[PDB]
Each structure stands twice: as C-alpha cells, then as structure tokens.
Design a protein around this ligand. Structure first.
Ligand code: NA
Ligand code: NA
Ligand code: NA
Ligand code: NA
Ligand code: NA
Ligand code: NA
Ligand code: NA
Ligand code: NA
Ligand code: NA
Ligand code: NA
Ligand code: NA
Ligand code: NA
Ligand code: NA
Ligand code: NA
Ligand code: NA
Ligand code: NA
Ligand code: NA
Ligand code: NA
Ligand code: NA
Lengths: 139, 143
C-alpha cells in the first residue's frame, strides 16, 4: 500500500488505525479528517470484504465520536466520493452553521485558505492524543 | 416509533424495506440516486447506531451499492451521510457518470432540480423493486 500523492499533498498523516490511515486536511475548515483503508487498488467500499467493511465502520464511528467529543459540531458529514482520486478514502468532517459551505457540501465549496502553522501544530497534537485513546492507533 | 422524515418522503419514492434500512429513490432525474434510512429513532449519525446495527447497515449499504454497479454500471459510486438540513440519519448511494451534470464534483447542491420523466420513473422504480428483491430480507412496498 502507498498513500496517493494527492492525499499526501493535501493532508498531514496523523497516524494509523488497524485498517485505516488517518489524515487531516490542511485546509482551515472542519476539522476535516480522512480515513484510507490500507488495501492496494481499492475503488469502492463494497469492494472490501464484508469483514474489512466491519473493521472500517468501527474505525469510522470511533473517529466520528472523536469529532463529536472535541469540536461539538452542529453536524458531522461522512462521504466516499473518489471521482478524481482513485484511492478509496472516506471523509469525516465536523460541520458548523457558520462554516463557508453550510448548509451545502464542503467538497468544491471551500475558500482554499490553509490553517495557520501554530494552529495546525496544536490541532495535530490534540488529534493524535485523542486518536491514541482509540484501540490500535499508532502514530 | 420510527417515521420517515417528511422531507425525505416528499423528495423520494419508497422502494421497500431491507431488514434495517428503508430504501428510497430520489425523484430527481440523475443517478440513480438512492437513500438508505435506518428505521430506528434518535439517529442523526452512523455512530449513533449500536455496533450490531452498524454492521447490518454496512452490509445493506454494500448490497445496494453492488446493485447499482451491476444494473447501471456507473463510472463511480458516491456514498454520503450529510443531513445538514434533515436531522434523520439517511445515507445517499449515487451512481455517477462522467457525463452527468455535476461530474466530477458532488451531486449535492449541483443539480438542475428537474424530476425524472414520469414514464422513466415508473420503469426505474419497478426495475429497482425487482432487483432489490434479490437482496436478503428486502420487502418491497408499492403503496
Ligand atoms: Na466546518
Ligand atoms: Na481540516
Ligand atoms: Na472484521
Ligand atoms: Na461512522
Ligand atoms: Na472520497
Ligand atoms: Na474514495
Ligand atoms: Na484505500
Ligand atoms: Na460535506
Ligand atoms: Na449520475
Ligand atoms: Na435518482
Ligand atoms: Na458517524
Ligand atoms: Na458500501
Ligand atoms: Na444524509
Ligand atoms: Na443530506
Ligand atoms: Na444523514
Ligand atoms: Na434514521
Ligand atoms: Na465523458
Ligand atoms: Na455526490
Ligand atoms: Na439535474
């Protein structure tokens, strides 16, 4: 397995859960996290075996609860699109009635602004700490 | 107990019930765009369901996604649980094509709003109910 170049360029790799690599989108919105099952040439969720899907949803829900516990979002959005980047990746985004894309989807509706260095470092450290409380996480 | 949210009822045609999720067809002329709605109250997010319910959900989601792949051969399938305006947990399953009006961006908020042709709607609904019936536990609803 190898993380797709586009996901690597757009994110900070927070660490690895048993199945999915966990990424943080660098854009100043969210937090916007992405789970990437470490399985080669994967296009659709249903292409994973039923058992891989089970581990995926467990990790997905653990990360979603993490977003709920730390950022008290008005709503959480989860999505698997992959129209351009072929490598299966699932977005997990904290949404607010005040964000630039509300109430529509974040995809294709952001300002493109990047999170400040000090802010990025602080968020990454907190996220890694909270992810470490999830079984199997490795930074 | 559980009751389909009025907005989803208005925007869709109920195809039937899988053991956990009600299966709906968005009336808009794009997709096919289906929506799965776990028939359990108090749900706004997937992680709100119990572990057992989540497992049943992902199995139903994949069975429906496989149905979309096998019957419409889309260029890509998109799945999403958004619900910024409709609190009731519902998961979008959409067949995407390089030629659809929203490609390569998301469908949400990027359609023309036009509803599928009447004759086309009846044909698609009937086809979907028949194909969904091949999935374990699916019970068609024609009301
Ligand atoms: Na946000
Ligand atoms: Na982010
Ligand atoms: Na498993
Ligand atoms: Na989840
Ligand atoms: Na995706
Ligand atoms: Na993807
Ligand atoms: Na993947
Ligand atoms: Na979104
Ligand atoms: Na489409
Ligand atoms: Na549709
Ligand atoms: Na969730
Ligand atoms: Na699926
Ligand atoms: Na939704
Ligand atoms: Na929605
Ligand atoms: Na929802
Ligand atoms: Na629901
Ligand atoms: Na094309
Ligand atoms: Na979409
Ligand atoms: Na349209």
């Amino acid at each position: 397995f190898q993380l797709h170049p586009r996901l690597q360029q757009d994110c900070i790799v927070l660490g690895n859960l048993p199945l999915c690599k966990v990424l943080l989108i660098k854009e100043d919105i969210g937090p916007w996290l992405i789970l990437v099952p470490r399985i080669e040439e994967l296009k659709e969720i249903h292409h994973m075996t039923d058992e891989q899907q089970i581990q995926f949803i467990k990790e997905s829900s653990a990360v979603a609860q993490l977003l709920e516990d730390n950022f008290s979002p008005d709503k959480i959005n989860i999505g698997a699109l992959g129209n351009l980047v072929p490598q299966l990746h699932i977005h997990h985004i904290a949404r607010f009635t005040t964000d630039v894309a509300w109430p529509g989807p974040v995809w294709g509706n952001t300002t493109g602004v990047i999170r400040a260095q000090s802010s990025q470092t602080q968020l990454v450290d907190l996220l890694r700490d909270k992810l470490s409380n999830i079984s199997g996480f490795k930074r």
